[PDB]
Amino acid sequence: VPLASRAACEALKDGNGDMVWPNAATVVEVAAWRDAAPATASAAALPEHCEVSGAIAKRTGIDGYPYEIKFRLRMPAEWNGRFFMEGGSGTNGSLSAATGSIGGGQIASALSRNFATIATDGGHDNAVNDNPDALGTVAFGLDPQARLDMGYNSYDQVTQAGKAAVARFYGRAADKSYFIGCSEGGREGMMLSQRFPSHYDGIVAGAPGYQLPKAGISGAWTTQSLAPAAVGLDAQGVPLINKSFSDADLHLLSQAILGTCDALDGLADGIVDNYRACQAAFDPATAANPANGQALQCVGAKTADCLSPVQVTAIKRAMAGPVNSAGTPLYNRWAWDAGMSGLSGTTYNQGWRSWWLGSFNSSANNAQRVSGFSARSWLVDFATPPEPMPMTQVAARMMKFDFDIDPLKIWATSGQFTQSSMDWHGATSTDLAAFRDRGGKMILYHGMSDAAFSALDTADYYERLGAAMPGAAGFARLFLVPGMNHCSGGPGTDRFDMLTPLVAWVERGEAPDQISAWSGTPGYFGVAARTRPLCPYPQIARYKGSGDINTEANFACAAPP
Ligand SMILES: [Ca+2]
């Protein structure tokens, strides 16, 4: 059977065929030859390739549901010798097209660049592991092994199955392996560098949820912090956290942040490049509304041009981060940034507020962290033992969350839950020497206006890494994105090709001194286009003093003033 052919492809199915899978419980459902597909308005052309899909470790969980680790692999006929895995998102449970997303709002897929590409659902399936008594598609959390699969094991099993298929199909191993993930996918990339250092040579970890079990602790905190500013009750009698601030209120706050913080980088441009000086300077309880030259905080009754003392107290407490009775921090604080709002044409940015507040225009709580996926995930996936409950109870549970008792549950084991959610899901280790010392390179990125995971918390991980590993910028660099929301969106340069510079760093030792980025919504600044350099932490973009402020070539990376 010739290598890299339709016959080699279809032979991967038989199971009586020659093919030897590292995991004996690997079942191939599909091995099909796929014709080249043209470019579309939204996707780069795909080459001719072999598509393999199936499942590892089919079983029944202790909840009585089916579990397996699905994968989908695409091996181009004409291969550049590179292997590529994409990361997940949310609580996973779906199996993408597996053409290899590189994020950063890119048109090009890794498969369109002649990589072999793989993806997984992470060990459960949203169509089948949907349990109306354990909050829907988070129900995989009732099964101890489904937790370990979600945390680390699925990515490991699928990486090995993929490299074995590559070696059989092409008759050689990949020259280099690359992983790109954002959010849950960025947690996965950091987990790979820590737990499986030789799985990937290059890793991009965007907005990484490396402490994801603490997300719901932040959520209980932001929920209780904002409840005083809430107006009205939902059907269960929970305050409408979504009514704490209107879109106009959040735009006023972002304008005040720009009034204090915009020019701290040397240029007034609707972007806070000097995020550190901003956190030192801005306090909404003393700052000016620069529209009217008066205090942001209302002196009399609430108007459109001010925030009430209760709103200011609420947002300051939410942003400060959760503490227990002892005043011990349980997560981290969040950065004040312009991307908490923004206006493009007639449209207010929803990309910050959807996490802690939800939609203003609603009679129900719909924030991720109040009643949505993130609050549900905490209760069933990260709390040990799990706390399944009707969906109508979730917001009340966040309101009565106890910061001395509930936070212990991400460190506990219980009955058949023999690892804590910090053990299986967390990726807090700074022991990266095995990764670095085999030639591994890691690009981290994070939007400053991310309300899922704190940019400042990624920066603190990076600080702890630099302290544990002198010269860390030789193998790992962090790119903070002023104005960007969770993975994409918001008034910043949220679009970039991370794969090109990753390949250059891994294969040529060329470290990214900067990464070109451009705004997906340049409407936020009223321009056609804005391109800026992303800078390796702790550097920021500095205007050179002349030229179009919308052109990258007029900016350099430097220490803050
Ligand atoms: Ca600026």
From Swiss-Prot:
Positions with a binding annotation for 4-[(2-hydroxyethoxy)carbonyl]benzoate: G90, E184, R369, S374, H486
UniProt: Ca(2+) binding residues: D262, D265, L267, D269, I271
EC number of the protein: 3.1.1.102
Active site per the UniProt annotation: S183, D450, H486
Outcome recorded upon mutating F382N: Gains a low activity towards BHET (bis-(2-hydroxyethyl) terephthalate)
Any one GO cellular component localisation term in the record: cell outer membrane
Compartments, record wording: Cell outer membrane
Cystine pairings recorded for this chain: C9-C50, C182-C487, C261-C278, C298-C306, C535-C557
Keywords linked to the UniProt accession: Calcium, Cell outer membrane, Disulfide bond, Hydrolase, Lipoprotein, Membrane, Metal-binding, Palmitate, Serine esterase, Signal
Outcome of mutating S374A: Gains a low activity towards BHET (bis-(2-hydroxyethyl) terephthalate)
One protein family per Pfam: Tannase
Reactions the enzyme catalyzes: 4-[(2-hydroxyethoxy)carbonyl]benzoate + H2O = terephthalate + ethylene glycol + H(+)
Practical application: Has potential for application in environmental remediation and biological recycling of PET waste products.
Keyword Membrane: yes
GO molecular function, one term: carboxylic ester hydrolase activity
GO biological process, one term: xenobiotic catabolic process
Induction: Highly up-regulated during growth on PET film.
Enzyme's top EC category: hydrolase
Similarity comment: Belongs to the tannase family.
Matching PANTHER family: FERULOYL ESTERASE B-RELATED
Function: Involved in the degradation and assimilation of the plastic poly(ethylene terephthalate) (PET), which allows I.sakaiensis to use PET as its major energy and carbon source for growth. Likely acts synergistically with PETase to depolymerize PET. Catalyzes the hydrolysis of mono(2-hydroxyethyl) terephthalate (MHET) into its two environmentally benign monomers, terephthalate and ethylene glycol.
Misc. remarks from the entry: The calcium ion is located far from the active site and appears to have a role in stabilization of the lid domain.
Protein name as catalogued: Mono(2-hydroxyethyl) terephthalate hydrolase
Species this chain originates from: Piscinibacter sakaiensis (Ideonella sakaiensis)
